[PDB]
């Protein structure tokens, strides 16, 4: 299959409660492999999977610099707490070749700046991000980012996948069943369950007489079980007597072929 390595970094200011917290978590697909938390104090970066502290420590300081600068760019007071988030990493195909790289930032939950897919240019969301853009253009930051994403990222993803091949390259199919719950004399809920799957990407749909029921289906967010696997369900309300007109459809990478399920 295709795979991704991604770091998700959060920096959050807290005036009057010390310097901003910095946390960086690294994933291969839906598997965490590292955490660095400036508030831990426990041994610096913690492995999170069985398969450079200094860069993480310096990244803490850089993110605090960023937060200072952003407060200024938005004319904000020193009293409020603000959030800077970063995502970066690479996507590779089944042959290990680069599909694309990522390096983007959000401030207070809004997109701020992103490295374009070319790995050479920036997209800035507003006049504040244009300041960052100019600074980064002047210092040739995109060239450094491109070198990391095309080189280090892809190389280390390939090495991790090989070391961790029994887990990272194993897709676990969903276990599936349909439940039935009357709501009244006139109607009942059918709920299609998918349990125990990895990775998290899945498609679960209901059809009625072969027509998609997108508007009428309640689909819960895919959720972690805590054992590496994920869970999801999709529900529809159906007239009593008409249950056999409804089919649940499941697509997942660990399935030899897609499932069609009905009640009983």
């Amino acid at each position: 299959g295709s795979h991704s390595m991604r770091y998700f970094d959060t920096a959050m200011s807290r005036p009057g409660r010390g310097e901003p917290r910095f946390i960086s978590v690294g994933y291969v697909d839906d598997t965490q492999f590292v955490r660095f938390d400036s508030d831990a104090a426990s041994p610096r970066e913690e492995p999170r999977a069985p398969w450079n502290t200094q860069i993480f420590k310096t990244n803490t300081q850089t993110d605090r610099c960023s937060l200072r600068n952003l407060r200024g760019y938005y004319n904000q007071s020193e009293a409020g707490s603000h959030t800077l988030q970063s995502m970066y990493g690479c996507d590779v195909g089944p042959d290990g070749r680069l599909l694309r790289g990522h390096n983007q930032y959000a401030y207070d939950g809004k997109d701020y700046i992103a490295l374009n897919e070319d790995l050479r240019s920036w997209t800035a969301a507003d006049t504040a991000a244009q300041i960052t853009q100019r600074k980064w253009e002047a210092a040739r930051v995109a060239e450094q980012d491109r070198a990391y994403l095309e080189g280090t990222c892809v190389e280390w993803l390939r090495r991790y996948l090989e070391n961790g091949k029994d887990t990272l390259e194993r897709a676990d199919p969903p276990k599936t069943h349909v439940t039935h719950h009357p709501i009244s004399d006139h109607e009942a809920t059918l709920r299609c369950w998918a349990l125990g799957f990895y990775p998290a990407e899945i498609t679960l749909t209901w059809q009625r007489d072969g027509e998609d029921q997108t508007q009428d289906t309640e689909l819960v967010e895919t959720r972690p079980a805590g054992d590496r696997t994920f869970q999801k369900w999709a529900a529809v309300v159906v007239p009593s007597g008409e249950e056999q007109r409804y089919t649940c459809h499941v697509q997942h990478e660990g399935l030899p072929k897609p499932l069609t399920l009905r009640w009983e």
Binding site: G26, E45, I55, N59, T62, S86, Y105, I113, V141
Partner: peptide, 10 residues
């Protein structure tokens, strides 16, 4: 064995 990226100040 983690290799994070050097960040740059916004």
């Amino acid at each position: 064995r983690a290799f994070p990226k050097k960040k740059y100040c916004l």
